[PDB]
Design a protein around this motif. Structure first.
Motif, short mmCIF file in Angstrom:
data_model
loop_
_atom_site.label_atom_id
_atom_site.label_comp_id
_atom_site.label_asym_id
_atom_site.label_seq_id
_atom_site.Cartn_x
_atom_site.Cartn_y
_atom_site.Cartn_z
N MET A 28 0.52 -0.85 -0.06
CA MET A 28 0.25 -0.08 -0.20
C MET A 28 1.01 1.23 0.44
N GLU A 29 0.04 2.44 -0.29
CA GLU A 29 0.72 3.80 -0.49
C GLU A 29 0.04 4.65 0.37
N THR A 30 -0.52 4.70 0.70
CA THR A 30 -1.65 5.94 1.10
C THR A 30 -2.21 4.93 2.14
N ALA A 31 -2.23 6.24 3.03
CA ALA A 31 -3.61 6.61 4.20
C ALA A 31 -4.63 5.82 4.03
N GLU A 32 -5.73 7.01 2.67
CA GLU A 32 -6.67 6.34 2.41
C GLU A 32 -7.02 4.46 1.87
N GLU A 80 -9.48 -0.52 2.45
CA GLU A 80 -9.69 -2.07 2.45
C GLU A 80 -10.08 -2.09 3.94
N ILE A 81 -10.35 -1.94 5.08
CA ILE A 81 -10.45 -2.14 6.18
C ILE A 81 -12.44 -1.34 5.58
N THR A 134 -12.82 6.65 10.63
CA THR A 134 -14.29 5.98 10.52
C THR A 134 -15.44 6.84 9.43
N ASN A 135 -15.83 5.07 9.34
CA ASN A 135 -16.91 5.85 8.75
C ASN A 135 -18.14 5.73 8.49
N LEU A 140 3.40 4.60 7.61
CA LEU A 140 3.16 6.16 6.95
C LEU A 140 3.19 7.33 7.38
N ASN A 141 3.53 6.75 8.69
CA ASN A 141 3.59 7.80 9.93
C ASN A 141 2.50 8.69 9.44
#
Ligand SMILES: CCCCCCCC(=O)OC[C@@H](O)CO
Ligand SMILES: CCCCCCCC(=O)OC[C@@H](O)CO
Lengths: 244, 244
Positions: B20-24, B29-30, B61-62, B168-169
Motif C-alpha cells: 500500500m501507499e496511502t492512508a486512504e 481496505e478495512i 471511521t466511516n 506511513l507516519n
C-alpha cells in the motif's frame, strides 16, 4: 476463508494453557509442543523494560546446561540476532546463516553445542516486556512443514505461555512490583507530565507537604532515590495506565 | 494441525497491506473487509500512551457523521466498554447487552444511530499505543460465521492496518516525535534511572554543563518544562529502548 483442524488445535491449546496451575506445567508443555514440531530444545527469554541501563533478561530453558553457561560466559546476548526485534517479520524469525554474519562467534559456538537449526517467535507483553520463544534442533535434516502453519502455532504458543506465567506471577515475566494506591498513581500521572510538587497541590486541592509525602512514600516502597525513577519506571511498564 | 484456505487468505492480505501507499488505501481496505464479513460500518480508534492525564484518542471511521458528533458530545469514551482492554479475551470482544450495563446511555444512543450489532479486536503497538478495530452493522439479523474464523481474520486486520499507518507516519498512530541523538538518549537512560546531572557527568566522562545542555536541548525540541517529562515520555513510548 475457513478450513478447520488448526482452528480446533487453537481451541484445544487455549483451554489447556488456561487450566494450568504451575510454572513447571508451562515449561513442560512448551517442551512438548516443540517436540511435536520435531524440535529438540526450546527456550523462553524475556527482555524487561527496566532497568533502563542494564536490562534484566530472565529466562528458562531445557538447553544443554553447558551451552547456557558458555552463552553467558562470552556474553553473546549483546550480539544475539534472534533476540533483536528488528530482525523479525510478523513476529517470526527463521534461523539462517546470513543472520549471524555480525555475530560469527555465537554462530560457531552454538553449533559446537549441538544447535544447528532453529526458529524464534516473539511478542511484547502488557508490561512492555519482550518475550522470545525459540525452538532448536541438533539435526540439519530437512523437516518439511508449511511455513504458515509453523508461524501461527508459535504465534499462539509464545503468547499463551507468557500470559500464563503472568497470571502465576512468575519471576521470569513479572516486572518490579509497585503496589501503589489510586491517589499515589494520580499524583504520579502529573509528575510525569512535568508538573512540580507545588502545582500538583493546586490541582488535587491538598497540602504541598501531602504531595511530598506520597512522593517519598512511593520512593520508599520500590527503593528509589527520587520521583524521576518512580515515574519513569511507572511509565516504562504502563502502571500510570492500561493493565495491572 | 493444518488446513489451508485461511492460510492463503492470510498470505494474500499480508502482501496487500505491505504494497500500500496511502492512508486512504488502508481505510478503504478495512471498509472493504468489514463488508466481506457482512458488517456495514467499521472504526479504528487509537489510545496514545501520552499525554498521561488527557490521553490523546485519535481515530478515523466511516460511521454516520451524526453519531461521531453525538458520541463526542456526551463524551461516551469515558464509559465505552469496547475501548477497555479489561473486557477482552484473546484481544477479541463480542458486543452484547450485558457488556453495557454500566454504560446504558451509550448503549441506547448507539442503537438510536443504527449501531445494533458489532465486535472489536484490539492490539498494543510498539509505541505502547492501544489500537482498537471495531466492526458494526445495523441489522440485528443473524449472520452465522465460525467464531474462530472471525477472530483470526480481525487479529490480522487490526495489526497490519495499524502497522501500515505507522510505516506511513499517520497522525492517528504516530506518538509525539522526539528525534534524539544516540548521546542524548544515552543521557536520558540514566536520567530515568534516577541519576543526577552530576552523577551522569562522572559516568559518561564529560562536563556537568555538557549534560545540562543536552537536557535543556531535548526539552526545547519537544517543548517540555523539565527533564522529568522528557524521560517519562521517552520511557512511556519506548524510545529509551526497543523500536523506533
Ligand atoms: C539466553 C537464554 C539462555 C541461553 C540460550 C539462548 C537463548 C536463545 O534462544 O538463543 C538462541 C540463539 O541465540 C542461538 O544462537
Ligand atoms: C470514538 C471513535 C468515533 C466514535 C465511534 C466510536 C468508536 C467505537 O468503535 O465505539 C463503538 C462502540 O462504542 C459502540 O457503542
Amino acid at each position: 476463508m475457513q478450513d478447520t483442524d488448526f482452528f480446533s488445535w487453537r481451541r484445544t491449546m487455549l483451554l489447556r494453557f488456561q487450566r494450568m496451575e504451575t510454572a513447571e506445567e508451562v515449561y513442560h508443555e512448551i517442551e512438548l509442543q516443540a517436540q511435536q514440531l520435531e524440535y529438540d530444545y526450546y527456550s523462553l527469554c524475556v527482555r524487561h523494560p527496566v532497568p533502563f541501563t542494564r536490562p534484566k533478561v530472565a529466562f528458562y530453558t531445557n538447553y544443554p546446561e553447558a551451552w547456557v553457561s558458555y552463552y553467558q560466559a562470552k556474553n553473546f546476548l549483546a550480539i544475539d540476532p534472534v533476540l533483536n526485534p528488528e530482525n523479525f517479520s510478523q513476529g517470526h524469525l527463521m534461523w539462517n546463516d546470513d543472520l549471524f554474519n555480525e555475530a560469527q562467534p555465537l554462530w560457531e559456538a552454538a553449533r559446537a553445542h549441538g544447535l544447528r537449526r532453529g526458529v524464534t517467535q516473539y511478542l511484547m507483553l502488557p508490561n512492555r516486556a519482550l518475550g522470545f520463544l525459540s525452538f532448536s534442533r541438533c539435526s540439519a535434516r530437512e523437516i518439511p512443514i508449511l511455513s504458515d502453519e509453523l508461524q501461527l502455532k508459535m504465534q499462539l504458543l509464545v503468547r499463551e505461555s507468557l500470559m500464563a506465567l503472568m497470571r502465576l506471577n512468575d519471576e521470569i515475566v513479572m516486572t518490579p512490583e509497585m503496589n501503589f494506591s489510586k491517589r499515589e498513581k494520580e499524583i504520579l500521572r502529573w509528575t510525569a507530565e512535568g508538573k512540580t510538587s507545588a502545582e500538583i497541590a493546586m490541582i488535587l486541592s491538598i497540602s504541598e507537604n501531602t504531595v511530598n509525602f506520597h512522593q517519598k512514600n512511593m520512593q520508599k516502597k520500590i527503593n528509589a532515590p527520587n520521583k524521576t525513577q518512580v515515574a519513569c519506571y511507572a511509565a516504562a511498564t504502563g502502571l500510570i495506565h492500561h493493565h495491572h
